[PDB]
Amino acid sequence: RIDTESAHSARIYDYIIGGKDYYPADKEAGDAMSREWPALPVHMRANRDWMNRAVAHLAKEAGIRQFLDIGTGIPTSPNLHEIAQSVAPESRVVYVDNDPIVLTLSQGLLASTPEGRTAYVEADMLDPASILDAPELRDTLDLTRPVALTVIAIVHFVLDEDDAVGIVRRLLEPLPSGSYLAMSIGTAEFAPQEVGRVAREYAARNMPMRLRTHAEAEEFFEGLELVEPGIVQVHKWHPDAATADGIRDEDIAMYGAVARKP
Numbered sequence: 001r002i003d004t005e006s007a008h009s010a011r012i013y014d015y016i017i018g019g020k021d022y023y024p025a026d027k028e029a030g031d032a033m034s035r036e037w038p039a040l041p042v043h044m045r046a047n048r049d050w051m052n053r054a055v056a057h058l059a060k061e062a063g064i065r066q067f068l069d070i071g072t073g074i075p076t077s078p079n080l081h082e083i084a085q086s087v088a089p090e091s092r093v094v095y096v097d098n099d100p101i102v103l104t105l106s107q108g109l110l111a112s113t114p115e116g117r118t119a120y121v122e123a124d125m126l127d128p129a130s131i132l133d134a135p136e137l138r139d140t141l142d143l144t145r146p147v148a149l150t151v152i153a154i155v156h157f158v159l160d161e162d163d164a165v166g167i168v169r170r171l172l173e174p175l176p177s178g179s180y181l182a183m184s185i186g187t188a189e190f191a192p193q194e195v196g197r198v199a200r201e202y203a204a205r206n207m208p209m210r211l212r213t214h215a216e217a218e219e220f221f222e223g224l225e226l227v228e229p230g231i232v233q234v235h236k237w238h239p240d241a242a243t244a245d246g247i248r249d250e251d252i253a254m255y256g257a258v259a260r261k262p
């Protein structure tokens, strides 16, 4: 089931940001993409760094102690639960992915603080019931208490015909007031030619992609209260000292946004 003869998004991602969890097909795809867009590693790294600042924000500033992460990806230190449990050891996290390789490396995701709880579910976000009714999720999270729904660097693989906005809002629906939605949303607006070429490289490798305008990204957050600065390129979302050190706007193809459910 690993299917090493074709490229997979989690593995290309892991290859580009410096992990070992990839195969020849994934390196080949990554290298072809970087040829088209030399800033790919800056962008992919900035996304992963955005995840870290967003989770830190949620855990620390917003006091969220429960996370549901859709499209978890291959584990890479610090993982979301590691950031959340470092602020608050009792924090709970459910990780979810549909790439079989993630399950093989799930031990790192399950390595929780004793006070906290983590779980991993292999499931498709296009089937929210299989996620929401998952025993692993129900034994881990209390849906009557606030939950941060993290949907990071995944929605660009969800085409309009599947209603990405609907799928996301369906997952947020059972979460109570005070919950949050944090997303990173792929866009070609800042480097249309190079990002466009990379998107067609994913499409040519059976990984259809949907890049979005700022107005399309706003659709996900209708009725939710956006945390300032709203929907901005990820390197401009609550940056650290050196978060944008040598990063041009054209080198970042993700919007980042965090919002509270009223």
Ligand SMILES: Nc1ncnc2c1ncn2[C@@H]1O[C@H](CSCC[C@H](N)C(=O)O)[C@@H](O)[C@H]1O
Binding pocket: 009, 010, 013, 047, 048, 051, 070, 071, 072, 073, 074, 096, 097, 098, 099, 123, 124, 125, 126, 151, 152, 153, 154, 157
């Ligand atoms: N329909 C689906 N259901 C669940 N996971 C999916 C999916 N489509 C893609 N994915 C997963 O989404 C991940 C995108 S990579 C992003 C990983 C992580 N959220 C991060 O931002 O750092 C991959 O691991 C891929 O396998």
